[PDB]
Amino acid sequence: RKTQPYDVYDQVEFDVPIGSRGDCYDRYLCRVEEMRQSIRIISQCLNKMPPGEI
């Protein structure tokens, strides 16, 4: 998502959670932490929508 583009998707800012060790409990904690970071990409998306065509 930030080594290739999709869309106008470069114009948002967020960080990509990493794990320390290599087990299930620290690939669990990505999924809890990505849900907090998805609220940031929604709240950054309401401010930016240009009116226009579809």
């Binding site: 907090r36 940031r40 709240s43 309401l46 929508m49 009116p51």
Partner: protein, 67 residues
């Protein structure tokens, strides 16, 4: 010309993570526990000792009869 986004009115909501409320820890506990437990045994020796006194009275009525 009827399209969505407002001119203003926003938050946002946080991305944060916090509820570390302490909590009565760290030598406060292990001190209310022992202070409660020693009140228990102090409430013993006033009943278990006293029941042994009435115990001997219960044997007393036996021995004053049976000739």
């Amino acid at each position: 010309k009827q399209d969505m986004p407002p001119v203003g009115g926003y938050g946002p909501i946080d991305y944060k993570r916090n509820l570390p409320r302490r909590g009565l820890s760290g030598y406060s506990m292990f001190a209310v526990g022992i202070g409660a437990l020693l009140f228990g045994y102090w409430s013993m020796m006033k009943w278990n000792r006293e029941r042994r006194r009435l115990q001997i009275e219960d044997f007393e009525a036996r021995i004053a009869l049976m000739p």
